[PDB]
Amino acid sequence: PSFIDYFNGIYGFATGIKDIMNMIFKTDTGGDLTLDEILKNQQLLNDISGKLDGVNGSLNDLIAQGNLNTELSKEILKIANEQNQVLNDVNNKLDAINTMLRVYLPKLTSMLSDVMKQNYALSLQIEYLSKQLQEISDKLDIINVNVLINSTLTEITPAYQRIKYVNEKFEELTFATPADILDELTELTELAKSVTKNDVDGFEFYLNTFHDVMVGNNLFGRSALKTASELITKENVKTSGSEVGNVYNFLIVLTALQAKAFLTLTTCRKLLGLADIDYTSIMNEHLNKEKEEFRVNILPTLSNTFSNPNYAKVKGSDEDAKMIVEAKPGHALIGFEISNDSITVLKVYEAKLKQNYQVDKDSLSEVIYGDMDKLLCPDQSEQIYYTNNIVFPNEYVITKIDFTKKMKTLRYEVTANFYDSSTGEIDLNKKKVESSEAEYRTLSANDDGVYMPLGVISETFLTPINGFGLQADENSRLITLTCKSYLRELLLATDLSNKETKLIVPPSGFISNIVENGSIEEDNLEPWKANNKNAYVDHTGGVNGTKALYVHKDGGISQFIGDKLKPKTEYVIQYTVKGKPSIHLKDENTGYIHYE
Amino acid sequence: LNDISGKLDGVNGSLNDLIAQGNLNTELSKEILKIANEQNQVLNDVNNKLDAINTM
Amino acid sequence: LNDISGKLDGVNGSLNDLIAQGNLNTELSKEILKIANEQNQVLNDVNNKLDAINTM
Amino acid sequence: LRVYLPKLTSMLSDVMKQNYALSLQIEYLSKQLQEISDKLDIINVNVLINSTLTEITPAYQRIKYVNEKFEELTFATEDILDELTELTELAKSVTKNDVDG
């Protein structure tokens, strides 16, 4: 579940959580010291006080206006004093409850509503990045390991588990927020008392040890970032990104963990009405030290090249074809995706740059190509792939990739336009580099198809492409497209320098799709429509957790998409269906039937 | 409610016993019986709530 | 707590004797009752703490 | 209390003085330890090493945390009670009788 929104880096959510923490500090509770006061006894105590003050006042008026002056009046005084003791206890409890209900509850419910409203988007972003990091870690191997890596895992697993569980639990108990509201406040206060309790093994201790293991202040001077980079850099790991992007994603996930932990800690200390400590300083210190560790001791030793993550056995016709993967004037290629669900297709992302290689979210055009398998794979008569890794200098961004399969050989040419780092404009100063001749590699003819690349070919965040190269392994009959990114520069200039960062993530979905609400996730079919009272939204149906369109008798669900098309231009249709369907791309005027 | 009932019942018992031990005046005893009946109503409400809790 | 209680019980008894044996019957006496009641609250808190400590 | 607070601040400063006088030696020796540890990138992990690490890392982590945080707070120190909040919380969590104290 990707998100088309500027992911502001560690600086982004760090400053967001700092603002939330300052706001929490600004919230005034007052006499929030009587926590052990059942708020569900307000009516009981109020009734008792109202019914007892009358008797107390009756006795007072009797002893005052009364003309009796004797030890009998002294006994009446003692009786009135005992009634006064009972009434005063009841009234103290009632006053505490009323203060807590009319000063301590509204402030905190508003504060927690704001906290959750602000944590929403951060949680979305960091959850997507956590999914990606978990995929990477699944692709890792920790069976035959080094002593330092093993020590880092030993030292970081308990604190990681604790912090993750506490963050998730606090988020759940806040979203939980009558008797239900009071029970939820009681649960929140229990969690806060547990988080803030004074013990050396407290939540704060685990936070500090997590930081010490992230920076390398453990037994062996080994930072978790170094072991992460060492595990992710090995040859076995095949991911959709470079080492820079993968270790930066690791850092993002763990720093977001820490920041949310500090936020929960502040919220708990405020909920319990405890002395403030201002963890913004400590949060910033930790995050900045970890970013500096990454920038100094980790980032320089990483490779900013990303290749194909997967391979697929396929065949391709020997019919010669020209392909030109180009970007519109002023745009730049920032990523690709080879998908072969049923047919081989290539998504290509184009976007204008803004500054320091930042990609523009508004300009994120997506083009589609279909003749990639017939171009990268031979059918029956061998193939000759020219292989050469191009590497343009800095300030040059690839714009065109020209594949020409004149004969049974494959030869690509790349063009790179000059890009000004200060501004966001790409001038028309072009450098053209081809696949050098002396280094070609031949795949012999084989009945079994060759292994075409497959997967997402792009950095963890869409960045310009510096160089592009093809490689072919004859023994394994593999083909790889290795591109080079500018993520190191974009990070050194925006995030690792504590400046406004703007990063986009590969959408993992055909943005160029012309069928609005194709996945049919919005329950209200404003785009689609039903002609007759049937064929409705079957929520149980669809790709696992979605809302499929359904048809029963003779009423078919239709959607108008005539305008967003072109004449005689090729198109690709795709759809999942269950049962005995009938799909038709039909024109009301004329009986022409495009797809049936 | 148990503590409240105990204290209120002790107060009411002390009052009633000390006023029955020696009756002095008409208006004084009248007002004492009035406030004692009010205290008895309060104690009865407290005991009703306590018995409701016990039944729960 | 024992010193505070021993020193406040004298004032409480003085106020009680003043309001009882005294022939004043006015809102002045009502305010004196309020003052004695506040002093009695303080004394009762002190005495509860002292009793708990002595029992323990 | 007014004769307590300054006396305790002076005592903490006098402690930190000699503590820092000592810390330089162990800092250099731990630097040498880290130098020898960097060479462990080629020694694979054995069951004995795995067990010893998994057994010592909790106690070591907690002891190091307590020591370094006490030093940090005593250095930051140089009503006052509002400033000694972290030090008092640390002292209350460190001198507490517990099953896992």
Author numbering:
A (entry chain D): 14 to 190, 202 to 620
B (entry chain C), C (entry chain B): 58 to 113
D (entry chain A): 114 to 191, 204 to 226
Please share excerpts from the published article on this structure.
In addition, Bt secretes to the medium numerous vegetative insecticidal proteins (Vip) that have been classified into three different families. Notably, members of the Vip3 family have shown to have a broad-spectrum activity against Lepidoptera4 and, since they target binding sites different to those of Cry proteins in the insect membranes, they are considered a good complement to the action of these toxins. Vip3 proteins are synthesized in an inactive state, as protoxins, and they require to be activated by proteases present in the midgut tract of the insect. To shed light on some of these questions, we have determined the near-atomic resolution structures of Vip3Aa in the protoxin and activated states by cryo-electron microscopy (cryo-EM).
Interestingly, the three-dimensional reconstruction, which converged at a global resolution of 2.9 Å, revealed that the Vip3 tetramer assembles into a pyramid-shaped structure where the N-terminal region forms the core and apex, and the C-terminal domains are exposed to the solvent. The cryo-EM structure of the protoxin reveals key insights into the molecular architecture of the protein, and shows that Vip3 is composed of five distinct domains, confirming earlier predictions. Domain I extends from the N-terminus to the primary protease cleavage site (K198), and contains four long, highly curved α-helices (α1–α4). The first helix is markedly amphipathic, and the second and third helices form an antiparallel bundle that adopts a different configuration in the outer (chains A and C) and inner monomers (chains B and D). In particular, the variable length of the α1–α2 loop allows the second and third helices of the internal monomers to rotate ∼90° compared with the external ones. This rotation further increases the curvature and tension of this element and leads to the formation of an eight-helix bundle that protrudes as a stalk from the tetrameric core formed by the subsequent domain. Notably, this second domain, composed of five α helices, embodies the core of the tetramer and plays a structural role mainly through two extended loops (comprising residues 221–226 and 239–247, respectively) that project toward the adjacent subunit and stabilize the Vip3 oligomer. In sharp contrast, the C-terminal region of Vip3 is composed of three globular domains that are mostly solvent exposed and do not show any interactions between different monomers. Domain III comprises residues 328–532 and contains three antiparallel β-sheets that form a β-prism fold strikingly similar to that found in members of the Cry insecticidal δ-endotoxins26. Notably, these two domains bear similar CBM (carbohydrate-binding module) folds that are connected by a long linker.
